[PDB]
Design a protein around this ligand. Structure first.
Ligand SMILES: O=C(/C=C/c1ccc(O)c(Cl)c1)c1ccc(O)cc1O
Length: 275
């Protein structure tokens, strides 16, 4: 599938950089014809078949195909896609209130603050899972706020670079996500489904309530070994005034067997969440 091959600079002006990774950079931008503002994600293309630099066209097309399907308050909206010899450029909804990763460093959250964020994450994931889309990269870096200067900020899941359609209940591919947040089946290179996202939600919830990462080791290999062994505990110093029901919610997500883990619907009916 081909994208718009006019020069993006003829239609947009770019500004502040919003983020930067191994194969992508995201810049704030403004569409010349409308004055509306967006985030432009420049993805470096692979230059040869057998290369390890850049992103394969199959991977780029999968991300675009998923973004084109989704429209929900808690996920980004794709506006346009351009390309040239070097890059695919996704023009995405601008979310300018900063990361969930940065806003937490300003403050642990109370259970009310945590559940206000968490309920929005669960709503966005409920939408994705209803469409059989696994995100495969849920972590604070990928959760951003629309406006951080309000008491209950609204959030959006802002990237879909590892997301996959799960039309057979599982997909058998390597997911090189962040060790602290990936489920045991990712660590063990097993078939992957929607359940992997629910594990990641459990990790996010643990961090929201405590400020501490449940599986983090001193090296990536230690973190991955901790995940596979489900080597985590609730430290009293961090959880002494956290409710038992909040711990129960986490405990039912950080479950090695994906079939025994809470689903997204289970998580919305769990007594900590259900109104
Ligand atoms: O920084 C990133 C995300 C940014 C962002 C910020 C505001 C927005 O509205 C939108 Cl859509 C995205 C990023 C994404 C993918 C990747 O591979 C590497 C990265 O660094």
């Amino acid at each position: 599938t081909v994208f718009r091959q006019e020069n993006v600079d003829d239609y947009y002006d770019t500004g502040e950089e919003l983020g930067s990774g191994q194969f992508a950079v995201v810049k704030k931008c403004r569409e010349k014809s409308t004055g509306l503002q967006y985030a432009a994600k420049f993805i470096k293309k692979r230059r040869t078949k057998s290369s390890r630099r850049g992103v394969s066209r199959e991977d780029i097309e999968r991300e675009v195909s998923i973004l084109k399907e989704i429209q929900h308050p808690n996920v980004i909206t794709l506006h346009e896609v351009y390309e040239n010899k070097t890059d695919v450029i996704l023009i995405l909804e601008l979310v300018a209130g900063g990361e969930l990763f940065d806003f937490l460093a300003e403050k642990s959250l109370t259970e009310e603050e945590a559940t206000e964020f968490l309920k929005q994450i669960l709503n966005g994931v409920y939408y994705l899972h209803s469409l059989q889309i696994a995100h495969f990269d849920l972590k604070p870096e990928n959760i951003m706020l629309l406006d951080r200067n309000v008491p209950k900020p609204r959030i959006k899941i802002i990237d879909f670079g590892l997301a996959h359609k799960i039309d057979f209940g599982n997909e058998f591919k390597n997911i090189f996500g962040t060790p602290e947040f990936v489920a045991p089946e990712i660590v063990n290179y097993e078939p992957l489904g929607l359940e992997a996202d629910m594990w990641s939600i459990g990790v996010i919830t643990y961090i929201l309530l405590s400020g501490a990462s449940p599986f983090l080791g001193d090296t990536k290999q230690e973190t991955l070994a901790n995940v596979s062994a489900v080597n985590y505990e609730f430290e009293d110093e961090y959880f002494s005034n956290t409710s038992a029901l909040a711990k129960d919610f986490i405990r039912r997500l950080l479950v090695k067997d994906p079939k025994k883990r809470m689903t997204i619907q289970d998580s919305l009916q769990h007594p900590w969440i259900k109104p």
